Design a protein around this ligand. Sequence first.
Ligand code: NI
Length: 341
Amino acid sequence: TCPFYKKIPGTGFTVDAFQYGVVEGCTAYFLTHFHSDHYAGLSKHFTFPVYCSEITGNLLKNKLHVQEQYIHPLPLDTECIVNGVKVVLLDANHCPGAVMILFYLPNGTVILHTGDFRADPSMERSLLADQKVHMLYLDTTYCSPEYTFPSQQEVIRFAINTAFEAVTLNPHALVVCGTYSIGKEKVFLAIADVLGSKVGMSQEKYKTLQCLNIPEINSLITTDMCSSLVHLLPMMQINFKGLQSHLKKCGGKYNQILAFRPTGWTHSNKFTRIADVIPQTKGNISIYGIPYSEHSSYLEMKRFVQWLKPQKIIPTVNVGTWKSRSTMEKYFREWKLEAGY
Ligand code: NI
């Protein structure tokens, strides 16, 4: 049964709640972004409206095969009426096509649902700057002060450096990048750009990328593996046995892989900086982990909430145990007492 933090009061609206069957009274099912925990349940056989971004729509039509009529894409940053309720979609700074949703209730209540987000100061000069938000449904993935990690522009620096080094030292080395969902495209696009290459990938991953409205995408990517020296691979595959396997397939065209596993937080963030990173090494294969996050750090989250001064906060992540719920409330109370709301 749909949990209360997936419903919007005073509406027929639900958010990311596609895995319960029909939801009694739900006229509309919102989807914040194309990640399988949030979309779990959608298919070709859905015959209720789905509101989402244009990009999320393309993924719905082409990857899940939902029928065009039931996909209502909406522009971002545009005041839109939906069953006689004003709503706005705002960029979530998560993956491609990921949005937050502003709901303007008839009664005067304003609600913000963040979806998955990486909070940023540019969100403080958006349409949110113009009015008061009473309820906040918040991505709490990293709501604990241990969770620090670098900026995305810092990570893209390291990456561009490491790869452009090794390839200039050894011009017969391959760059590999791990992946298992949309997100983090900047990692491989930036490396390929510094190397003068296209990124090569499976057909299914090519298909996914062709849905994302990336400008000039036809010049950046290929299904011809042979022609490319930045390859993508399933994240499951990014290990020694699997990289050996893959290094066989390229047929004596490269003599060294240099891989990147973009990850979120891991416990080695607590002790080691990004400039002082190293890889595991079993022969000529070298696997880097790099903490490129598309979720708010604790400090980023804290700042966004303290600016927003919401009257109430409803977590959407780590809500499954009383211990986590309890820890989170304590942080929300501190933030409130510091900031005076
Ligand atoms: Ni996500």
